[PDB]
């Protein structure tokens, strides 16, 4: 089972190892629950761009087969309903509530907000660092960022998400085949509490709009219901929440990790706009924030691939991380190297194979203009800032079944 494989120990600091095992003695796997994981760069590719019609989200009868605790589990229940789990004409209404605050042009207006955060935690940062204090650089800059980039664009106080910044990463955890039963549980419970917090921030924003995207959400929703129903609202809320802000985290939890770890890449961030993305770009080939995405797709036929057949109506996941470092699209795929990137579109190799850990199709990450943004603005500045920063130790991961999270990125002056 590679889900299994994929949540021990063993594997935990590099699965990329087990990854490569798999796209070339299983690459088209079937789980010991049935769930099947395709780990090859062309079959993820396709199976994201088929997702319309070769795949689609669980219907009510998918989801009592696949899922029988759903009737349960309020995190499941809560996930069937977002945008993720649709496709159009629903997925199309979906997206456009919430699409214009995530355009190129919407996310340019957050960055001086960007900036403003980003020099006023170094300046903290510095001051802590100057006197040989070891900082933990994931909770005092890494999280912090984006959770308040995102708190502005959301509606949320900066006291909200800090509040709920616990909750997340437990209902985050039990969104993967892998999750334990108390963890489902946990899910569940802290599924709750973020629902309760929306009930509260829903009437807040009805009687007091502002200029956030859960204002607009909840007049559209008071305005028309076949727009936006009570279950979509909710789902919605909960999911951008979700999505807001831990992957983005761990994007530069991983950069200054992959700044720290190769110098000589490290002069791509001293150059101008292009060379700087081209360095982001790669941080996100080389270690997806998500190996594998929760979100289910149903197979509508029996699909035969090679010598195996996925039976319709089966579960399947794709393995975006392994894909990165798949050779049959990205050269030499264990070295990191900013050059794959520079000079082209965003995600696209010069060769013309894509990144995929923001996935790909109808369900392309929302949000990848919003982490790429903030990357560019901060993650130049830290290395200016502090050219002779050190790890202290090794980093702390945040043991997932599936998400390339950190507890800790302990770093101290030289
Ligand atoms: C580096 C940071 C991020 C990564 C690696 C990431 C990853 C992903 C992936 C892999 C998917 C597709 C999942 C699938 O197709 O199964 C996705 C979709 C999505 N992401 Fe991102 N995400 C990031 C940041 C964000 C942020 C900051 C937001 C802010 C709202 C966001 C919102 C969304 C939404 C709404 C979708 C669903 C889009 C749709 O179904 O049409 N993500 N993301
Ligand atoms: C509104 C939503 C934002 C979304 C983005 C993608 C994200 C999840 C699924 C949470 C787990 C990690 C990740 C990266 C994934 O795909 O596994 C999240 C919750 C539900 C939907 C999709």
């Known amino acids: 089972d590679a889900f299994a494989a994929l949540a021990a120990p063993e594997n935990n600091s590099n699965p990329y190892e087990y990854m490569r095992w798999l796209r070339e003695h299983d690459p088209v796997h079937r789980s010991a629950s049935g769930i099947f994981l395709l780990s090859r760069h062309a079959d993820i590719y396709w199976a994201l761009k088929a997702t319309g019609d070769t795949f689609r989200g669980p219907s009510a009868g998918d989801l009592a087969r696949l899922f029988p605790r759903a ?47 980003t020099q006023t935690r170094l300046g903290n940062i510095a001051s802590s660092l100057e006197k040989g204090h070891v900082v933990n650089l994931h909770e005092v800059f890494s999280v912090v960022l984006p959770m308040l980039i995102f708190a502005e664009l959301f509606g949320m106080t900066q006291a909200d998400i800090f509040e709920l910044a616990a909750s997340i990463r437990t209902i985050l955890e039990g969104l993967n085949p892998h999750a334990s039963d108390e963890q489902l549980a946990a899910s569940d419970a802290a599924s709750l509490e973020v629902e309760r917090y929306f009930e509260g921030l829903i009437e807040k924003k009805r009687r007091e709009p502002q200029s956030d995207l859960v204002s607009v959400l909840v007049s559209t929703h008071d305005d028309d219901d076949d727009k936006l129903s009570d279950t979509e609202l909710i789902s919605m809320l909960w999911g951008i929440l979700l999505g807001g802000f831990a992957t983005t985290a761990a994007m530069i939890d991983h950069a200054i990790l992959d700044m720290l770890a190769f110098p000589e890449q490290r002069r791509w961030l001293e150059g101008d706009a292009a060379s700087v993305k081209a360095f982001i770009e790669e941080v996100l080939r080389y270690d997806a924030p998500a190996m594998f995405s929760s979100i289910p797709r149903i197979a509508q036929y029996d699909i035969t691939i090679g010598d195996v057949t996925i039976p319709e109506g089966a579960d399947v996941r794709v393995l975006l991380a392994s894909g990165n470092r798949d050779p049959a699209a990205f050269p030499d795929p264990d070295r990191f190297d900013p050059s794959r990137f520079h000079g082209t579109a965003p995600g696209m190799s010069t060769y013309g194979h894509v990144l995929l850990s923001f996935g790909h199709g109808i369900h392309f990450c929302l949000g990848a203009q919003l982490a790429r943004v903030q990357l560019a603005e901060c993650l130049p500045v830290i290395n200016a800032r502090f050219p002779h920063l050190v790890l202290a130790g090794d980093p702390v991961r945040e043991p997932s079944a599936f998400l390339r999270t950190f507890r800790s990125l302990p770093v101290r002056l030289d």
């Open 71 to 117: 009737a349960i589990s309020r995190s499941l229940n809560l996930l069937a309903s977002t945008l993720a789990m649709k496709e159009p004409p629903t997925h199309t209404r979906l997206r456009r509530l919430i699409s214009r605050d995530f355009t190129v042009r919407q996310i340019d207006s957050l960055r001086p907000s960007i900036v403003q955060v």
